[PDB]
A = this chain, B = another copy of it.
Amino acid sequence: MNHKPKGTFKDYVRDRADLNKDKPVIPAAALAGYTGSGPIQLWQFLLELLTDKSCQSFISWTGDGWEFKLSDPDEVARRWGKRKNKPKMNYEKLSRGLRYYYDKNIIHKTAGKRYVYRFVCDLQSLLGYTPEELHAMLDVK
């Protein structure tokens, strides 16, 4: 409905694409649609970030199966808040959300480490991808 001194939407999309954004292997919205889970849930959002090459500086696979690390916990929480429109979201609430998945055997925390968790549900059968395959697509060593 209006233009800025510099940069159209086409430019915006191209610039983000060049930064490897907007192409997660496992988009949360699509995954929620596939499972009919309704509104996006935290574990699905984490999978989207983990399969989005542009997010590797703040959340990444460790290379061991479905183990991952929140390199920058605050940034993960900020993005979750933005996606769900929850401005009060912070690491505190994020971590509580992660601990909630323990009992449900969806995500577990790695002992002896900090900020390292692991999906423990059968994502291979759900997604159709092995961790090794995703690591390869995302250049994880």
Q: Are B122 and A2 in contact (CB under 8 A)?
A: yes
Q: Are A30 and B12 in contact (CB under 8 A)?
A: yes
Which A28-53 residues have C-beta < 8 A from chain B? Answer: 30-31, 33-34, 38-39, 43
A57 touches B (CB below 8 Å): no
- The contact of A126 among B9, B16, B85, B106, by CB within 8 Å, is B9
A136 touches B (CB below 8 Å): no
In the complex the two chains form, what is the Cα distance from A90 to B27 in whole Å?
Answer: 27
Binding site for B on A (CB under 8 A): 1-3, 8-13, 16, 22, 26, 30-31, 33-34, 38-39, 43, 85, 106, 119, 121-123, 125-129
Known: A2-B122, A39-B85. A9 touches B22 (CB 8 A): no
Which residue on chain B has the smallest CB distance to residue A104? B1
Give the chain B neighbours of A121 by CB distance below 8 A: 1-2
Q: Are B126 and A8 in contact (CB under 8 A)?
A: yes
Known: A39-B85, A125-B8. A30 touches B13 (CB 8 A): yes
Q: Are B85 and A11 in contact (CB under 8 A)?
A: no
Show 28 residue pairs from A and B whose CB-CB distance is below 8 angstroms, ordered by the A residue.
A1-B43, A1-B106, A1-B121, A1-B122, A1-B123, A1-B126, A2-B121, A2-B122, A2-B126, A3-B122, A3-B125, A3-B126, A8-B125, A8-B126, A8-B127, A9-B30, A9-B34, A9-B126, A9-B128, A10-B128, A10-B129, A12-B30, A12-B33, A12-B34, A13-B30, A13-B34, A22-B30, A38-B85
